[PDB]
Design an enzyme around this catalytic site. Structure first.
Site, PDB file in Angstrom:
ATOM      1  N   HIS A 107       0.033   7.292   2.730  1.00 46.80           N
ATOM      2  CA  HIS A 107      -1.253   7.849   3.101  1.00 46.80           C
ATOM      3  C   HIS A 107      -1.176   8.441   4.495  1.00 46.80           C
ATOM      4  O   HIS A 107      -0.236   8.174   5.241  1.00 46.80           O
ATOM      5  CB  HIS A 107      -2.319   6.797   3.054  1.00 46.80           C
ATOM      6  N   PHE A 137       0.839  -1.208   0.000  1.00 49.55           N
ATOM      7  CA  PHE A 137       0.000   0.000   0.000  1.00 49.55           C
ATOM      8  C   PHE A 137       0.867   1.249   0.000  1.00 49.55           C
ATOM      9  O   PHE A 137       1.864   1.315   0.720  1.00 49.55           O
ATOM     10  CB  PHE A 137      -0.983  -0.040   1.170  1.00 49.55           C
ATOM     11  N   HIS A 143       2.602   7.430   6.046  1.00 52.33           N
ATOM     12  CA  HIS A 143       3.181   6.117   6.197  1.00 52.33           C
ATOM     13  C   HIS A 143       2.718   5.201   5.085  1.00 52.33           C
ATOM     14  O   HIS A 143       1.764   5.509   4.370  1.00 52.33           O
ATOM     15  CB  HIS A 143       2.876   5.542   7.568  1.00 52.33           C
ATOM     16  N   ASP A 196      -3.844   8.570   7.793  1.00 54.60           N
ATOM     17  CA  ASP A 196      -5.051   7.891   8.231  1.00 54.60           C
ATOM     18  C   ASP A 196      -6.267   8.832   8.337  1.00 54.60           C
ATOM     19  O   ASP A 196      -6.149  10.007   8.752  1.00 54.60           O
ATOM     20  CB  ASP A 196      -4.886   7.207   9.582  1.00 54.60           C
TER      21      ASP A 196
HETATM   22  N1  LIG Z   1     -13.080   0.443   6.048  1.00 53.53           N
HETATM   23  C1  LIG Z   1     -12.737   1.411   7.086  1.00 53.53           C
HETATM   24  C2  LIG Z   1     -11.609   2.381   6.745  1.00 53.53           C
HETATM   25  C3  LIG Z   1     -10.348   1.608   6.297  1.00 53.53           C
HETATM   26  C4  LIG Z   1      -9.170   2.516   5.916  1.00 53.53           C
HETATM   27  C5  LIG Z   1      -8.068   1.702   5.284  1.00 53.53           C
HETATM   28  O1  LIG Z   1      -8.305   0.923   4.359  1.00 53.53           O
HETATM   29  N2  LIG Z   1      -6.828   1.884   5.796  1.00 53.53           N
HETATM   30  C6  LIG Z   1      -5.641   1.401   5.132  1.00 53.53           C
HETATM   31  C7  LIG Z   1      -5.427  -0.127   4.996  1.00 53.53           C
HETATM   32  O2  LIG Z   1      -5.990  -1.044   4.446  1.00 53.53           O
HETATM   33  N3  LIG Z   1      -4.248  -0.112   5.749  1.00 53.53           N
HETATM   34  C8  LIG Z   1      -4.334   1.346   5.968  1.00 53.53           C
HETATM   35  S1  LIG Z   1      -4.339   1.472   7.758  1.00 53.53           S
HETATM   36  C9  LIG Z   1      -3.175   0.028   7.932  1.00 53.53           C
HETATM   37  C10 LIG Z   1      -1.704   0.427   7.714  1.00 53.53           C
HETATM   38  O3  LIG Z   1      -1.425   1.780   7.409  1.00 53.53           O
HETATM   39  C11 LIG Z   1      -3.725  -0.959   6.833  1.00 53.53           C
HETATM   40  C12 LIG Z   1      -2.771  -1.956   6.359  1.00 53.53           C
HETATM   41  O4  LIG Z   1      -2.881  -2.125   5.000  1.00 53.53           O
HETATM   42  O5  LIG Z   1      -2.040  -2.644   7.050  1.00 53.53           O
HETATM   43  C13 LIG Z   1     -13.992   2.159   7.543  1.00 53.53           C
HETATM   44  O6  LIG Z   1     -15.020   2.239   6.945  1.00 53.53           O
HETATM   45  O7  LIG Z   1     -13.803   2.738   8.722  1.00 53.53           O
HETATM   46 FE   LIG Z   2      -2.367   3.898   7.783  1.00 57.31          FE
END
Ligand SMILES: N[C@@H](CCCC(=O)N[C@@H]1C(=O)N2[C@@H]1S[C@H](CO)[C@@H]2C(=O)O)C(=O)O
Ligand SMILES: [Fe+2]
Length: 321
Positions: A212, A209, A268, A214
Protein backbone atom coordinates in the site's frame (compact mmCIF):
# COMPACT_ATOMS: atom_id res chain seq x y z
CA UNK A 1 17.40 -13.41 1.51
CA UNK A 2 16.07 -9.90 1.23
CA UNK A 3 18.49 -6.94 0.99
CA UNK A 4 18.34 -4.31 3.77
CA UNK A 5 16.74 -0.99 2.75
CA UNK A 6 18.75 2.20 3.13
CA UNK A 7 16.91 3.93 5.95
CA UNK A 8 19.19 6.61 7.40
CA UNK A 9 18.99 7.93 10.92
CA UNK A 10 18.54 11.69 10.82
CA UNK A 11 19.01 13.86 13.89
CA UNK A 12 15.99 16.14 13.60
CA UNK A 13 16.74 18.13 16.73
CA UNK A 14 17.78 21.27 14.75
CA UNK A 15 14.23 21.52 13.36
CA UNK A 16 13.04 22.56 16.84
CA UNK A 17 15.55 25.46 17.06
CA UNK A 18 16.70 28.66 15.33
CA UNK A 19 19.94 27.61 13.61
CA UNK A 20 18.84 28.01 10.00
CA UNK A 21 21.92 26.51 8.31
CA UNK A 22 21.72 23.49 10.61
CA UNK A 23 18.05 23.12 9.58
CA UNK A 24 19.15 23.19 5.93
CA UNK A 25 21.60 20.35 6.57
CA UNK A 26 18.69 18.32 8.07
CA UNK A 27 16.51 19.24 5.06
CA UNK A 28 19.20 17.89 2.72
CA UNK A 29 19.13 14.56 4.52
CA UNK A 30 15.35 14.46 4.28
CA UNK A 31 15.57 15.25 0.55
CA UNK A 32 18.07 12.44 -0.01
CA UNK A 33 16.04 9.86 1.90
CA UNK A 34 12.84 10.94 0.17
CA UNK A 35 14.41 10.55 -3.25
CA UNK A 36 15.95 7.13 -2.37
CA UNK A 37 13.83 4.52 -0.54
CA UNK A 38 11.39 7.07 0.86
CA UNK A 39 12.05 6.15 4.51
CA UNK A 40 14.22 7.52 7.28
CA UNK A 41 14.40 7.29 11.06
CA UNK A 42 13.97 10.53 12.96
CA UNK A 43 16.24 10.43 16.01
CA UNK A 44 16.77 12.94 18.83
CA UNK A 45 13.03 13.68 18.51
CA UNK A 46 12.41 14.41 22.17
CA UNK A 47 9.47 12.03 22.70
CA UNK A 48 9.42 9.45 25.50
CA UNK A 49 8.67 6.42 23.33
CA UNK A 50 9.31 3.83 26.05
CA UNK A 51 6.54 5.39 28.14
CA UNK A 52 4.29 5.48 25.04
CA UNK A 53 4.92 1.78 24.56
CA UNK A 54 4.28 1.00 28.22
CA UNK A 55 1.00 2.93 28.47
CA UNK A 56 -0.19 1.43 25.17
CA UNK A 57 0.64 -2.09 26.37
CA UNK A 58 -1.26 -1.49 29.62
CA UNK A 59 -4.29 -0.51 27.56
CA UNK A 60 -4.17 -3.31 25.00
CA UNK A 61 -3.62 -5.98 27.62
CA UNK A 62 -6.32 -4.81 30.02
CA UNK A 63 -9.22 -3.91 27.72
CA UNK A 64 -12.03 -6.52 27.82
CA UNK A 65 -14.35 -7.85 25.10
CA UNK A 66 -17.20 -5.88 26.68
CA UNK A 67 -15.27 -2.62 26.36
CA UNK A 68 -14.24 -3.37 22.79
CA UNK A 69 -17.90 -3.70 21.67
CA UNK A 70 -18.72 -0.51 23.57
CA UNK A 71 -15.94 1.40 21.72
CA UNK A 72 -16.29 -0.41 18.36
CA UNK A 73 -16.40 1.42 15.02
CA UNK A 74 -19.45 0.82 12.87
CA UNK A 75 -17.84 -1.96 10.80
CA UNK A 76 -18.13 -4.05 14.01
CA UNK A 77 -21.10 -2.46 15.80
CA UNK A 78 -24.10 -1.24 13.81
CA UNK A 79 -25.26 0.89 16.81
CA UNK A 80 -22.29 3.20 16.25
CA UNK A 81 -23.11 4.79 12.91
CA UNK A 82 -21.12 7.99 13.75
CA UNK A 83 -17.89 6.00 14.32
CA UNK A 84 -16.22 5.49 10.97
CA UNK A 85 -12.66 6.43 11.98
CA UNK A 86 -12.45 6.73 15.77
CA UNK A 87 -12.83 3.79 18.13
CA UNK A 88 -11.93 0.13 18.46
CA UNK A 89 -11.18 -2.15 15.53
CA UNK A 90 -11.75 -5.68 16.82
CA UNK A 91 -9.76 -8.84 16.11
CA UNK A 92 -11.68 -11.86 14.92
CA UNK A 93 -10.13 -14.93 16.65
CA UNK A 94 -9.36 -17.69 14.17
CA UNK A 95 -9.51 -15.14 11.28
CA UNK A 96 -8.10 -11.61 11.82
CA UNK A 97 -5.27 -11.26 14.28
CA UNK A 98 -4.70 -7.51 14.47
CA UNK A 99 -6.76 -5.13 16.58
CA UNK A 100 -6.43 -1.38 17.08
CA UNK A 101 -7.77 1.77 18.68
CA UNK A 102 -7.91 5.00 16.67
CA UNK A 103 -8.36 8.51 17.89
CA UNK A 104 -8.47 11.92 16.25
CA UNK A 105 -7.85 15.55 17.21
CA UNK A 106 -8.87 16.03 20.89
CA UNK A 107 -10.23 19.45 19.88
CA UNK A 108 -13.03 17.70 17.90
CA UNK A 109 -15.52 18.17 20.71
CA UNK A 110 -19.32 18.26 20.37
CA UNK A 111 -19.22 22.09 20.00
CA UNK A 112 -16.51 22.12 17.30
CA UNK A 113 -17.97 23.77 14.15
CA UNK A 114 -17.02 20.80 11.92
CA UNK A 115 -18.64 18.34 14.35
CA UNK A 116 -21.76 20.55 14.48
CA UNK A 117 -21.87 20.57 10.66
CA UNK A 118 -21.31 16.80 10.55
CA UNK A 119 -18.48 17.33 8.09
CA UNK A 120 -17.09 14.03 6.74
CA UNK A 121 -13.90 12.68 8.42
CA UNK A 122 -14.52 14.60 11.66
CA UNK A 123 -15.66 12.64 14.73
CA UNK A 124 -15.60 13.04 18.47
CA UNK A 125 -13.26 10.55 20.07
CA UNK A 126 -14.55 7.67 22.19
CA UNK A 127 -12.74 6.56 25.33
CA UNK A 128 -12.86 3.67 27.77
CA UNK A 129 -14.11 4.17 31.31
CA UNK A 130 -11.61 6.19 33.33
CA UNK A 131 -11.92 3.92 36.38
CA UNK A 132 -10.98 0.85 34.29
CA UNK A 133 -8.15 2.65 32.48
CA UNK A 134 -6.92 5.34 34.84
CA UNK A 135 -4.89 8.04 33.13
CA UNK A 136 -5.18 6.52 29.66
CA UNK A 137 -7.26 9.24 28.00
CA UNK A 138 -5.07 12.00 29.43
CA UNK A 139 -1.93 10.17 28.37
CA UNK A 140 -3.26 9.53 24.86
CA UNK A 141 -4.37 13.13 24.35
CA UNK A 142 -0.98 14.44 25.57
CA UNK A 143 0.71 11.98 23.18
CA UNK A 144 -1.30 13.43 20.30
CA UNK A 145 0.13 16.88 21.04
CA UNK A 146 3.70 15.53 21.58
CA UNK A 147 3.65 13.76 18.19
CA UNK A 148 1.90 16.79 16.64
CA UNK A 149 4.88 18.85 17.73
CA UNK A 150 7.40 16.43 16.25
CA UNK A 151 5.36 16.34 13.05
CA UNK A 152 5.29 20.14 12.78
CA UNK A 153 9.08 20.17 13.07
CA UNK A 154 9.39 17.43 10.40
CA UNK A 155 7.07 19.38 8.08
CA UNK A 156 9.47 22.35 8.38
CA UNK A 157 12.29 20.03 7.24
CA UNK A 158 10.22 18.78 4.25
CA UNK A 159 9.38 22.36 3.27
CA UNK A 160 13.04 23.40 3.33
CA UNK A 161 14.00 20.23 1.42
CA UNK A 162 11.62 21.18 -1.41
CA UNK A 163 12.96 24.74 -1.71
CA UNK A 164 10.05 26.36 0.16
CA UNK A 165 9.82 28.55 3.27
CA UNK A 166 9.68 26.43 6.44
CA UNK A 167 5.97 27.03 7.13
CA UNK A 168 4.86 25.86 3.63
CA UNK A 169 3.18 22.73 5.02
CA UNK A 170 3.04 23.59 8.72
CA UNK A 171 0.78 26.58 8.19
CA UNK A 172 -1.95 24.08 7.17
CA UNK A 173 -1.28 21.80 10.17
CA UNK A 174 -3.04 23.42 13.07
CA UNK A 175 -4.31 22.17 16.45
CA UNK A 176 -7.84 23.51 15.94
CA UNK A 177 -8.52 21.62 12.72
CA UNK A 178 -5.99 18.92 11.87
CA UNK A 179 -7.47 15.66 10.60
CA UNK A 180 -4.41 13.74 11.91
CA UNK A 181 -5.03 10.39 13.60
CA UNK A 182 -3.23 8.13 16.06
CA UNK A 183 -3.71 4.38 15.73
CA UNK A 184 -2.62 2.04 18.50
CA UNK A 185 -2.23 -1.28 16.68
CA UNK A 186 -1.72 -4.54 18.52
CA UNK A 187 -0.12 -7.43 16.63
CA UNK A 188 -0.52 -10.48 18.86
CA UNK A 189 1.49 -13.61 19.49
CA UNK A 190 -0.83 -16.53 18.74
CA UNK A 191 -0.22 -20.27 19.02
CA UNK A 192 -1.45 -21.56 16.75
CA UNK A 193 -1.55 -18.58 14.42
CA UNK A 194 -4.71 -18.38 12.22
CA UNK A 195 -3.76 -19.04 8.55
CA UNK A 196 -6.68 -16.87 7.54
CA UNK A 197 -4.82 -13.88 9.11
CA UNK A 198 -1.76 -14.59 6.99
CA UNK A 199 -1.62 -13.40 3.43
CA UNK A 200 1.03 -14.57 0.95
CA UNK A 201 2.56 -12.11 -1.56
CA UNK A 202 3.29 -12.94 -5.19
CA UNK A 203 6.98 -13.37 -4.27
CA UNK A 204 6.15 -15.96 -1.54
CA UNK A 205 6.53 -13.66 1.45
CA UNK A 206 4.05 -14.25 4.29
CA UNK A 207 2.28 -10.97 5.15
CA UNK A 208 0.01 -9.47 7.74
CA UNK A 209 -0.81 -6.58 5.37
CA UNK A 210 -0.36 -6.29 1.59
CA UNK A 211 1.33 -3.52 -0.32
CA UNK A 212 0.00 0.00 0.00
CA UNK A 213 0.80 3.67 -0.13
CA UNK A 214 -0.14 5.64 2.98
CA UNK A 215 -3.12 8.01 3.08
CA UNK A 216 -1.32 10.95 4.64
CA UNK A 217 0.92 13.93 3.91
CA UNK A 218 3.61 12.13 5.97
CA UNK A 219 3.42 9.18 8.41
CA UNK A 220 5.25 9.31 11.77
CA UNK A 221 5.50 5.76 13.15
CA UNK A 222 6.73 4.14 16.32
CA UNK A 223 7.09 0.34 16.29
CA UNK A 224 8.45 -2.31 18.63
CA UNK A 225 11.87 -3.72 17.96
CA UNK A 226 10.72 -6.60 15.76
CA UNK A 227 11.60 -6.32 12.08
CA UNK A 228 8.50 -6.50 9.84
CA UNK A 229 8.24 -3.69 7.28
CA UNK A 230 9.40 -3.90 3.68
CA UNK A 231 9.67 -1.25 0.98
CA UNK A 232 9.45 -1.82 -2.74
CA UNK A 233 12.47 -0.48 -4.63
CA UNK A 234 13.82 -1.09 -8.14
CA UNK A 235 15.89 -3.88 -6.50
CA UNK A 236 12.60 -5.49 -5.32
CA UNK A 237 11.24 -5.50 -1.76
CA UNK A 238 13.85 -4.67 0.89
CA UNK A 239 13.68 -5.06 4.69
CA UNK A 240 13.35 -1.95 6.83
CA UNK A 241 15.36 -2.47 10.02
CA UNK A 242 13.52 -1.95 13.30
CA UNK A 243 14.53 0.81 15.68
CA UNK A 244 12.32 1.24 18.73
CA UNK A 245 14.17 4.45 19.76
CA UNK A 246 13.31 6.34 16.60
CA UNK A 247 10.32 7.34 14.53
CA UNK A 248 10.10 5.83 11.05
CA UNK A 249 9.04 8.59 8.64
CA UNK A 250 7.70 8.34 5.09
CA UNK A 251 5.58 10.35 2.65
CA UNK A 252 1.98 9.60 1.88
CA UNK A 253 0.17 10.01 -1.40
CA UNK A 254 -0.86 13.63 -0.71
CA UNK A 255 2.87 14.55 -0.70
CA UNK A 256 3.33 12.64 -3.95
CA UNK A 257 0.44 14.54 -5.50
CA UNK A 258 1.77 17.98 -4.36
CA UNK A 259 5.32 17.28 -5.60
CA UNK A 260 4.32 15.51 -8.88
CA UNK A 261 5.88 12.32 -7.53
CA UNK A 262 9.24 13.96 -6.88
CA UNK A 263 8.74 12.72 -3.30
CA UNK A 264 6.98 9.46 -3.98
CA UNK A 265 4.74 7.78 -1.49
CA UNK A 266 6.71 4.52 -1.12
CA UNK A 267 4.92 1.22 -1.55
CA UNK A 268 5.40 -0.86 1.54
CA UNK A 269 3.96 -3.93 3.25
CA UNK A 270 3.94 -5.68 6.60
CA UNK A 271 5.55 -9.14 6.96
CA UNK A 272 3.82 -11.70 9.10
CA UNK A 273 5.78 -12.22 12.34
CA UNK A 274 4.40 -14.34 15.18
CA UNK A 275 5.32 -11.89 17.93
CA UNK A 276 3.53 -9.67 20.41
CA UNK A 277 4.25 -6.18 19.17
CA UNK A 278 3.06 -2.63 18.59
CA UNK A 279 2.63 -0.41 15.57
CA UNK A 280 1.68 3.17 16.55
CA UNK A 281 1.33 5.40 13.49
CA UNK A 282 0.48 9.11 13.51
CA UNK A 283 -0.97 10.04 10.14
CA UNK A 284 -0.13 13.63 9.44
CA UNK A 285 -3.23 15.08 7.80
CA UNK A 286 -3.99 18.76 7.17
CA UNK A 287 -7.34 20.50 7.58
CA UNK A 288 -10.52 19.71 5.70
CA UNK A 289 -10.28 22.82 3.52
CA UNK A 290 -6.47 22.84 3.18
CA UNK A 291 -5.27 23.14 -0.40
CA UNK A 292 -1.67 23.34 -1.47
CA UNK A 293 -1.18 24.12 -5.14
CA UNK A 294 0.68 21.23 -6.79
CA UNK A 295 4.19 21.97 -8.03
CA UNK A 296 7.11 20.17 -9.61
CA UNK A 297 10.59 20.75 -8.14
CA UNK A 298 12.22 19.10 -11.19
CA UNK A 299 10.95 21.82 -13.53
CA UNK A 300 12.67 25.19 -13.88
CA UNK A 301 9.30 27.05 -13.50
CA UNK A 302 8.09 24.67 -10.79
CA UNK A 303 4.76 24.21 -12.63
CA UNK A 304 2.74 20.98 -12.46
CA UNK A 305 -0.14 19.67 -14.65
CA UNK A 306 -1.93 18.26 -11.60
CA UNK A 307 -5.19 19.71 -10.33
CA UNK A 308 -5.38 21.13 -6.80
CA UNK A 309 -7.07 18.76 -4.39
CA UNK A 310 -8.33 19.76 -0.95
CA UNK A 311 -7.11 17.66 1.93
CA UNK A 312 -10.66 16.73 2.95
CA UNK A 313 -11.44 15.42 -0.57
CA UNK A 314 -8.13 13.50 -0.61
CA UNK A 315 -8.82 11.94 2.79
CA UNK A 316 -12.46 10.97 2.21
CA UNK A 317 -11.47 9.35 -1.09
CA UNK A 318 -8.44 7.60 0.39
CA UNK A 319 -10.09 6.17 3.50
CA UNK A 320 -12.79 4.48 1.37
CA UNK A 321 -10.14 3.12 -1.01
N1 LIG B 1 -7.99 4.66 10.86
C1 LIG B 1 -7.11 5.68 10.31
C2 LIG B 1 -6.38 5.32 9.02
C3 LIG B 1 -5.61 3.99 9.19
C4 LIG B 1 -4.87 3.54 7.92
C5 LIG B 1 -4.34 2.14 8.10
O1 LIG B 1 -5.07 1.23 8.49
N2 LIG B 1 -3.03 1.96 7.80
C6 LIG B 1 -2.45 0.65 7.65
C7 LIG B 1 -2.36 -0.28 8.89
O2 LIG B 1 -3.14 -0.82 9.63
N3 LIG B 1 -0.96 -0.33 8.85
C8 LIG B 1 -0.90 0.56 7.67
S1 LIG B 1 0.13 1.90 8.26
C9 LIG B 1 1.18 0.75 9.29
C10 LIG B 1 2.25 0.03 8.45
O3 LIG B 1 2.31 0.31 7.07
C11 LIG B 1 0.09 -0.22 9.88
C12 LIG B 1 0.59 -1.52 10.31
O4 LIG B 1 -0.29 -2.52 9.96
O5 LIG B 1 1.58 -1.73 10.99
C13 LIG B 1 -7.87 7.01 10.17
O6 LIG B 1 -9.05 7.14 10.14
O7 LIG B 1 -7.03 8.03 10.07
FE1 LIG C 1 1.77 2.06 5.60
Amino acid sequence: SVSKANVPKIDVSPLFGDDQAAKMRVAQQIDAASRDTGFFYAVNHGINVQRLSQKTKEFHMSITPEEKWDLAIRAYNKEHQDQVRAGYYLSIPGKKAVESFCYLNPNFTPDHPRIQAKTPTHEVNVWPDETKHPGFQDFAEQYYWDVFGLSSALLKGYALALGKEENFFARHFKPDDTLASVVLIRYPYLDPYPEAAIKTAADGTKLSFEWHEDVSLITVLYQSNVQNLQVETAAGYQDIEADDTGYLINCGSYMAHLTNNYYKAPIHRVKWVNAERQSLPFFVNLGYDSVIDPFDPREPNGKSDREPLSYGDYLQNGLVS
